[PDB]
Hints:
Two copies of one chain form a homodimer.
Chain A: H1 7-12, E1 23-26, E2 29-34, E3 37-42, E4 48-52, E5 64-69, E6 75-84, E7 90-98, E8 103-104, E9 114-119, E10 126-130, E11 133-137, E12 145-146, E13 156-158, H2 163-170, E14 176-178, E15 184-191, E16 197-202, E17 212-217, E18 227-234, E19 246-249, H3 253-256, E20 260-267, E21 272-279, E22 284-292, E23 299-301, E24 307-310, E25 325-326, E26 332-338, E27 344-350, E28 357-358, E29 366-372, E30 376-381, E31 392-397, E32 404-406, E33 419-423, E34 429-434, E35 441-446, E36 451-457, H4 460-466, E37 473-480, E38 485-492, E39 502-507, H5 525-531, E40 536-541, H6 550-553, H7 563-577, E41 581-591, H8 593-602, E42 611-615, H9 626-633, H10 642-646, E43 661-667, H11 675-687, E44 693-697, H12 707-724
Parallel strand pairs in A: 39-40, 39-41, 41-42, 42-43, 43-44
Antiparallel strand pairs in A: 1-2, 2-3, 3-4, 5-6, 6-7, 7-8, 9-10, 10-11, 11-12, 13-15, 14-15, 15-18, 16-17, 18-19, 20-21, 21-22, 22-23, 22-24, 25-26, 26-27, 27-28, 29-30, 30-31, 31-32, 33-34, 34-35, 35-36, 37-38, 38-40
Helix pairs in contact in A: 7-8
Bound molecules: the ligand COc1cc(OC)cc(-c2nc(N)c(CN)c(-c3ccc(Cl)cc3Cl)n2)c1 (2 copies) and 2-acetamido-2-deoxy-beta-D-glucopyranose (8 copies).
Residues 150, 156, 191, 193-194 of chain B line the site of one 2-acetamido-2-deoxy-beta-D-glucopyranose (NAG).
Pfam families (chains A, B): DPPIV_N (PF00930), Peptidase_S9 (PF00326)
Catalytic activity (chains A, B): Release of an N-terminal dipeptide, Xaa-Yaa-|-Zaa-, from a polypeptide, preferentially when Yaa is Pro, provided Zaa is neither Pro nor hydroxyproline
Membrane topology (chains A, B): Single-pass type II membrane protein
Amino acid sequence: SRKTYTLTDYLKNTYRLKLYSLRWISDHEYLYKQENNILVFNAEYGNSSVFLENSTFDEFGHSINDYSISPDGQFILLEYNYVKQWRHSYTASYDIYDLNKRQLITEERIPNNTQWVTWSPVGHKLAYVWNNDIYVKIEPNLPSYRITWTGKEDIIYNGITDWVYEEEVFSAYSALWWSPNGTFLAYAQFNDTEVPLIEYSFYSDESLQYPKTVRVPYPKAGAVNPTVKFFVVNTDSLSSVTNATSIQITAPASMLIGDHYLCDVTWATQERISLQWLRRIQNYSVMDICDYDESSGRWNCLVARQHIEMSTTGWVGRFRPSEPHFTLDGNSFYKIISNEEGYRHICYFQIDKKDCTFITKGTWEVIGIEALTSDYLYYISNEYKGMPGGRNLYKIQLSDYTKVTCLSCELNPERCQYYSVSFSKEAKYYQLRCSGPGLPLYTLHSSVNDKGLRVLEDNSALDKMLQNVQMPSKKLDFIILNETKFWYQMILPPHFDKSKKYPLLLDVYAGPCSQKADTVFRLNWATYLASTENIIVASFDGRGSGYQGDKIMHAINRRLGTFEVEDQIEAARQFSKMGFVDNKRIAIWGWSYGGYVTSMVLGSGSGVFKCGIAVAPVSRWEYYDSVYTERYMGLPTPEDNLDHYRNSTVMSRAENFKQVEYLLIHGTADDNVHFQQSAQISKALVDVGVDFQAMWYTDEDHGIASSTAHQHIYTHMSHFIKQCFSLP
Amino acid sequence: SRKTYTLTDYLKNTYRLKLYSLRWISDHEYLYKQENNILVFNAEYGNSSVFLENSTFDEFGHSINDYSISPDGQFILLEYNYVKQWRHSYTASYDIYDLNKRQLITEERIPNNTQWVTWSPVGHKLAYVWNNDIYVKIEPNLPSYRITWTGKEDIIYNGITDWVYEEEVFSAYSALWWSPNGTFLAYAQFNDTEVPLIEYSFYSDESLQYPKTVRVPYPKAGAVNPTVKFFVVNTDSLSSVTNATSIQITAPASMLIGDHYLCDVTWATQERISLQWLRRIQNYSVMDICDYDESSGRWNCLVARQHIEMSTTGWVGRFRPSEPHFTLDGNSFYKIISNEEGYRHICYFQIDKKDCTFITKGTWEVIGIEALTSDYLYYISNEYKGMPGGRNLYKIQLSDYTKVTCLSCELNPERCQYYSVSFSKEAKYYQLRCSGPGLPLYTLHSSVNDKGLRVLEDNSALDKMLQNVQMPSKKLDFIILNETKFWYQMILPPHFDKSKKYPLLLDVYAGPCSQKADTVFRLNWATYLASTENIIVASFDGRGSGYQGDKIMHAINRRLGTFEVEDQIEAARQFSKMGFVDNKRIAIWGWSYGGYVTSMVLGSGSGVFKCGIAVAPVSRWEYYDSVYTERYMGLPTPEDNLDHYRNSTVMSRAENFKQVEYLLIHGTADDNVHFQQSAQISKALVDVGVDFQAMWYTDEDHGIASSTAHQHIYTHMSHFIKQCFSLP
Ligand SMILES: COc1cc(OC)cc(-c2nc(N)c(CN)c(-c3ccc(Cl)cc3Cl)n2)c1
Ligand SMILES: COc1cc(OC)cc(-c2nc(N)c(CN)c(-c3ccc(Cl)cc3Cl)n2)c1
Ligand SMILES: *[C@@H]1O[C@H](CO)[C@@H](O)[C@H](O)[C@H]1NC(C)=O
Ligand SMILES: *[C@@H]1O[C@H](CO)[C@@H](O)[C@H](O)[C@H]1NC(C)=O
Ligand SMILES: *[C@@H]1O[C@H](CO)[C@@H](O)[C@H](O)[C@H]1NC(C)=O
Ligand SMILES: *[C@@H]1O[C@H](CO)[C@@H](O)[C@H](O)[C@H]1NC(C)=O
Ligand SMILES: *[C@@H]1O[C@H](CO)[C@@H](O)[C@H](O)[C@H]1NC(C)=O
Ligand SMILES: *[C@@H]1O[C@H](CO)[C@@H](O)[C@H](O)[C@H]1NC(C)=O
Ligand SMILES: *[C@@H]1O[C@H](CO)[C@@H](O)[C@H](O)[C@H]1NC(C)=O
Ligand SMILES: *[C@H]1O[C@H](CO)[C@@H](O)[C@H](O)[C@H]1NC(C)=O
C-alpha cells in the first residue's frame, strides 16, 4: 500500500482512533462533549441537543480542564489550574456555574488547591477535600461545613488516599463514598505518621539554583504501613454552631489482631454499607455489613453476616478481593470468586446465609459483572471460542442460571472479539465498545430485546487512511508446553514471508495477572517496528499470567522472578524453531514489571537474546512498595520469605551481562519504582566489569510521559534496536 | 613486533612510575619508608638506620593508613580507621606510640572520629579537632584542654574549614596554625549558618532500603557565604578546670565593609602573624600584620602597616593572593606579584614602607618561591628557553639581584625539563624531582656549592620494561593566532608517519590559569589511545591559560566559555591544516571545567568536531560554588554580570548538538560539580529533541575514582571513541 507507518506517525499521532465517551445522566440520556460543546442525547430515539455551548465561558479567563454536571442538571463544576500529583491524584480550582440562571457563584467559593470534589449522587450537594480535611456544601452558594479537623500534610489523610492506598488499593485519590440518598457521607482516614519517606531530587526549571528534595511517605516492603479508620457522617444533620459528628466503624477483631487494609467500600442501600478488609498477609479478607440504627444513630456490623475469603494457593482476588454487586433491596449480592477448580466465577450471596452459589462455571473466567437487574445479571468473560484474550458481554436469566445469552459474540465476529460496556442508570440501555482485532466500533443498544439502535462511531475515517499504509498484521495463537497452553501474539511486518528470517523483539511485561496476548487493536511502537523496520514483535503470556485460572496465576506465588522469567525465555526458544526467525537477532524489552523481567532475562545466561532494553525496572523487591510486593512475596524476614527476596535481585546476576548488549533507562523523579532501583543495577554492573548503555530522564516519573521525553526515549530506543539488529 | 600500550596496561597499572617521597626532619636528615621499615637517612653521606621497625605494629590490630612523627623525636602518631570526606578532608582514629618506651599510650587517647590533628612545630604538643571543636594536649599521655565550646555539625567550624574553604580557599581541611614556639595556636572559625544546602541521594550497598539524602552547606554563586572570625590562644597558660581565653583578631575596616574571605595566615616570628584578606569581589585584598603585645596580652594590627594588592585587569593572584615568604627577622618578606607588563615576579617588601621592589623581571613567570636564606632566594620559573610548560630551579644572590644561577637547566637537558624541589630545614640540602620529559629522576644535592650528591631513583626498572613496548612520543610546540604564540602538545602514535592521516582527539581542560601543554612524562588514557589505537591526542593552551602573563591569562576576565572556547576550536582547525590529521575524525573530550568547555565547543556549530565526550561538566555558572565562580564572573545580578552568566550555559546551545555525537557522563554523588548540572544539560537536549549518549555513576563523585568506576568509565569512553572513529 506503498508508504509505511513511521516512528514519526506514532510519536506525532498521524492516525488517531476515534472514541465515543458518553456520560449516562439518567436511564435514558447521555452527555457527550463534541469539540468543546456538551451535547445531550436521548437513547431510545437518537435525537440530541446542546446542553452547554462551547462558547459559554469565553470571558472566564482561566483555561478549563474539565467539568462535572450535578445530577439534577442544576449546576456545573468548573475545574481549572489543574496540577498533577501521582497516578490518579491532582489539585485544582473550581467555580460552580448555575444553569437556570447564567451566573457564576461569587459566594462561598471552593478554595484553590482543592484536592478532591464530588457531588452527591442525587441532587446537588458537594463534598470536598482541602488541606487534607473534608468539607460539605448543601447548596452551591452557601457556606460549607468542615467535617474533619485532623488534616495535616503527609501524615493525616481524611477523605483522600496516601501514596500506597492511591496506587495499590483504591486506584483513585478519593476516599469518600456518598450513600445513594446523599444522606450520609462515609469516608476513610489514613495516618502515615510513622511511614518511612522516600526522598529524591527534583531539578525543575533551569532557573532553580538549588535542586528541591521531594519526600513522600512510602512503605517499602516490610516497613511500617499506614493505619486506616472508617467513618460515616450524617449529611442531613449539619449545623453552624455545632461541629459535625462522625461515627467510626471498626474493623472486625479478626483484622484488628495485626496490620490490615481497608480494601473495598460499597453502599448497599440507604442504610446499609459493605466494607471489605484484608490482612496484610494478604490471604485473608473479611466482608462486614453495616447498618444504621435509626434510634441509636450508630452503625452496627453483625459478626454473623460476616463473609470470609481465603486462598490456599495464593493471595485473594486478582489484585484484591472483588467488588460486590447488590440486588436492589440489599439482602444479597453477587461477586466474583475463585472456585474449587481455580477458575474465577460469579457467586450469589444471600445475606445472613452460609456459603454461596456459583451461577457460572467452566474453564474460563468472568472479568467483570457489569449490571444487575431484577431479571438479569450482565457480565463479561473470555469464554468465547475458548480465547483468554477475547472478551464478550453475557446475559444470565436469574430465574434459571442455565440460560446464558451472548450479547456480543456475533455482532461482528471478524472485526470484534474484545468488548467492554457501559449500561445506563437502571440499565434500560447500553453502549458496546469493541477494541479489536479490527478497528474500534462503538454501538448503542436497548436491553429490552437486545436491539441495536445506532452505530455511534466506526472510525471509518481512519480505516480509509490506513488503507494507504503498509500495515502489519497481528497473529494471536499459542504453544503447548507441558500439557498446558500458553498464548502469544505476534505483530508481523506487512508482506510477511514465512520463507524469510526476521529478527524478533520480545515485548515483555508479565507481572502477576497480566495479559500481553490479546485481540485488541493498537497503534504503537511495535506498530512502527514491524512496519518500517520489518522486525517481528512477540508477546507471551506464560505462568503467573491472568484470566486463565489460578494454577497458572498462582504459580508465581512467593516466587517472583522465576517461572515468569523462565517462560519468556522458553517462548523465545520456541519462536526460533519456527523457521521465520533469525536466532542471531532476538531481543527483549520492557517497562515496569517488564523491565525487571527483561533484566532478569538478560541476566540468566540463556544465550537466546542478543540484547534488551529495561525501562524503569524493579531490581530488588525490598525496594518496591509493601502492598503490591507483599501480595506475592510475603514478608522479607527469615521467618517468612527473605531468602527468595534475596535470590531474586537483578544485581546478583550481573556477571552474566558480559554476554549481551543492555540498555537501562529511568526517570529520576520516578516516585513509584525508585530511580534507586536502576542506580543499584548499574553499580552492580560496574563492580563486575561489564559495559552497558544508560539513559536517565531528569524529572520524569514512571510513565516518562511528557511529549518531549516520550518522543526522545522511543527515538533513543529505536536506534539501539536498529543497531543491535544491523538495520539502517 | 613489540607489544603496544593497551587499555588494560593503563587501567591495571602494569607500567608503574617509581617515586621517592621523603620528609626532611632537620637540616641534614630525612625520613624515607622502605620495605615498610621507616628509615632515617643522612643527606651528606647517604647512610641509613631503622627509625621504626617494620615489625612494630603487626599485632597492632588495625591497618595503619599513615603516620606522623613528633618533631622533637619523642613520639609518633598512627592514623587508622581513615574515612575520607571531600578533596582534603577526612576523619580518623589515632594511637600514640611513645618511642623511649615500647609503648602505646593507653590514657587520654585522641578520640575516634577525630577530624584534624597536628604536632606543634617543635617538641611534642598536640592540637586536634573533634566534633568541630579544638583540643590541646601539652603531653601525649595527659588530659586534653578544650579550647572551643561552640562547634556544631554543619554550622560552626573551629580549626577546620567548611566546604568552600576546603575546596577553594585553603586546599586543606585544616584551619589551625601553630606559632613557631608552639607557644601559640592560631585558628579560624567559620560560620555557615545561613549558607544554603545542596541535597543529593546516596544509595550505598544494595542492603540499604531507603536512600539517604546528603546535605552540605554549599554556597552557589551569588548566595550567602559562610563567615569567618579569627583567633589566637596561648598554649602556655591553660588551666585544669579554667576555660581558655582566645583573643580575637578583626579583619580590617576595608573588609568589614562587606563580604570577604580570609585567604592566608603566615607566622612571621614568635610574636608576629600575617593574615591576608580578600573581598568577595576578588579585586582587592589586604595583608595585615599583627604583633603580640607583652602588656595587654593582645594582638594589634597597625593600619599603617597594611599592604594592598588590587587588580584592574582581573582578580588577584593566580588563584588567590600569594604567599609571603618572611626574612628570618620578620621585618621584610618576599611574595609573587604581577608586574607592569603583567608578568608574575618576586617582589621585595619592607614591613613599614609602602611599595615593593622587583627582583626578577622578564617575559616569563616565577611559579613559586621555594626557599629563603640570609644569602639567597630559591624559586622555580619557566624561564629556560622561553618554554612556559617547562619548570626549573633558580638561585638569587640577595646581595646582587642580577646574580642568578639556574640550578637545574643543565643537569640532564634532554631528559629533564620539569623540576620541583624540596629543601631541608635551612636549605643546607635539597631533593630535585624531575618529571619529564623522560622518566622521572630524583636527585639529592648539597647547597653550599650546589653539587650532585647521589641519584635517588632513576626509574631504570621502568626503563627496561618499556623498551619492550611501542610507546607514543610527545610533540610540544606552538602556533600563532592573531600575532601571539600559543603552545599545544601532541601525543603521537609510535612509528608515526606524517604522510598518513590520523584521527585526532582534543583533550581539553582550559580553565583559568590552566596549562595542558607542558614537558611532563605521563602514562595515561592518551598513551593508550596513541599506542594501541593510533589516535593523535592533542591539547592546547589558549587565552585564559596560565603562566604566560596577565594579557593571556585575564583575557577571559568576566567572560567564561568565551575565548577559551573559540581558541580550542581554532587550534583544531589548525591541526586540521596539518597533512597528517584527517578532518573527518576530529573529536574532543574533557573532565570538569574541561567538560564545560567540551560541551560549549560541541554546541558552537563550528562543524570541526564529529563527536565528543564531557565528564562531570559545569553547565551553568549559577550552579557552581561562589568563591571560584565569582572570582572570574563577578556576581550574577543585573547590576553586575548576570547577562553573561545567562549567555554562557551549555543549555542555550542545545539545538546545535544535533550536528554531533555526544556522550555525557556524571557521578550521582558529586558534591563539587553537582549532578544537577548534567541533569540540566540532558533535559535541554531532550526538550529540543537531540539524541545523545549518557552514563551516570551511582555514588561516585567528582573524581569517579573508585577502582571499578575508573575501570569502567575509561572503558566506556574508549568504545565510544573507537566507534566514532570507525576503529575495530
Ligand atoms: C502494564 O501496563 C499497565 C497499565 C496500567 O494502566 C495505565 C497500569 C499499570 C500498573 N498500575 C499500577 N497501579 C501498578 C502498581 N504499582 C502497576 C505495577 C505493577 C507492578 C510493578 Cl513492579 C509496578 C507497577 Cl506500577 N502497574 C500497568
Ligand atoms: C586539572 O585537574 C585538576 C587537578 C587537581 O589536582 C589533582 C585539582 C583540580 C582542582 N582543584 C580545585 N580545588 C578546583 C576548585 N574547584 C578545581 C576545579 C576547577 C574548576 C571547576 Cl569548574 C571545577 C573544579 Cl573541581 N580543580 C583540578
Ligand atoms: C427529543 O425530541 C423529543 C420530541 O421533541 C423531545 O421531547 C426531547 O426533548 C428531545 N430530546 C433531546 C435530548 O434533544
Ligand atoms: C484562589 O486564588 C486566586 C488567584 O490567586 C484568587 O483570586 C481566588 O479568589 C482564590 N480563592 C478561591 C478561588 O476561592
Ligand atoms: C497517628 O498515629 C500515631 C502513631 O500511632 C499517633 O500517635 C497519632 O496520634 C495518630 N494520629 C491520629 C489522628 O490518628
Ligand atoms: C470542632 O470540633 C473539633 C473536634 O470534634 C474541635 O477540635 C474543634 O475545636 C471544634 N470547634 C468548635 C467550633 O467547637
Ligand atoms: C650515618 O653514619 C654515621 C657514621 O657512623 C652515624 O653517626 C650516623 O648516625 C648515621 N646516620 C644514620 C641515618 O644512620
Ligand atoms: C575505638 O574503636 C574501637 C573499635 O574500633 C573501640 O573498641 C574503642 O573503644 C574505640 N575508642 C577508642 C579506642 O578511642
Ligand atoms: C553564626 O552566625 C549566626 C548568624 O549568621 C549567629 O546567629 C550565630 O550566633 C553565629 N554563631 C556563632 C557561635 O558565632
Ligand atoms: C621487612 O624488611 C625486611 C628486612 O629487609 C625485608 O627483607 C622483609 O621482606 C620485610 N617484611 C615485610 C613484611 O615487608
